[PDB]
Structure 1
Amino acid sequence: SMTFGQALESLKRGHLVARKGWNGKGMFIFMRPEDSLPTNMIVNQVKSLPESFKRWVANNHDRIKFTAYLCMKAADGTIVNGWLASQTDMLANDWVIVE
């Protein structure tokens, strides 16, 4: 069992990790890597972007960079983009590799 810092190194290597002390069942987090897209892709191709964002991009622009980030497979089976580490998650040492 490991610290949050070790779990973050395993996430950057592509593993799934979880805390034993979480309330929800069968959950895990994983990392999604950075991506860089031409601005035309963003305005015409990328799904799930608001029109207001797309207009700002068109108005202010080569390439747009999406930073890497963490995600969660939740207890209900949903995927949450943008998982949050609580105070307890960050300071705990009950992290485990789950895949």
Structure 2
Amino acid sequence: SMTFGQALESLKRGHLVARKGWNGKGMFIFMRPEDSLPTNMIVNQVKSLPESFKRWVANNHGDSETDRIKFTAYLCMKAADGTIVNGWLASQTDMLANDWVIVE
């Protein structure tokens, strides 16, 4: 048996984990790391953000002032169809289950 709590501690240590009880097959979850980025980079360089958010950052930072924004750690899933889902969330079942397994 393995709890979500134990799976989370394995995730925090960099492992890939999954539930035997999921409907989809061949899936797993993993943690993406925290990073703190300079505001100028966010505004002028990061491709993976909408323009309205780059605008909010620019208007609160000016591409100046030694400024940084922390992007917190989060969970992701390699889904059944091979896509990567940023921001995996745990169902009630996932949270309370004890069929978790280390995938790698």
> Which of the five TM-score ranges fits, normalised by the shorter chain?
over 0.9
Instruction: Give the deviation of 1:58 after TM superposition.
Output: 0.4
Instruction: Give the deviation of 1:98 after TM superposition.
Output: 0.4
Instruction: Give the deviation of 1:31 after TM superposition.
Output: 0.2
Structure 2: runs of 5+ lacking an equivalent: 62-66
Cα RMSD (Å): 0.6
Instruction: Give the deviation of 1:47 after TM superposition.
Output: 1.5
What per-residue deviation string (whole Å, max 9, x for no partner) do you get for residues 55-87 of structure 1? 000001100000000000000000000001000
Larger radius of gyration: 2
Instruction: Give the deviation of 1:89 after TM superposition.
Output: 0.2
Equivalent residue for 1:97? 102
The CA distance in 2 between the partners of 1:98 and 1:54, in whole Å, is: 37
2:85 is equivalent to residue 80 of structure 1: yes
The list of structure 1 runs, each at least 4 consecutive aligned residues, that deviate by more than 6 angstroms after superposition, is: none
Instruction: Give the deviation of 1:35 after TM superposition.
Output: 0.5
Instruction: Give the deviation of 1:90 after TM superposition.
Output: 0.2
The CA distance in 2 between the partners of 1:72 and 1:22, in whole Å, is: 12
Structure 1: runs of 5+ lacking an equivalent: none
What per-residue deviation string (whole Å, max 9, x for no partner) do you get for residues 24-55 of structure 1? 01000000010000001101111221110000
The CA distance in 2 between the partners of 1:85 and 1:19, in whole Å, is: 11
The CA distance in 2 between the partners of 1:47 and 1:80, in whole Å, is: 18
Equivalent residue for 1:49? 49
The CA distance in 2 between the partners of 1:51 and 1:13, in whole Å, is: 34
Aligned residues: 99
TM-score, reference length from structure 1: 0.98
The CA distance in 1 between the partners of 2:49 and 2:15, in whole Å, is: 28
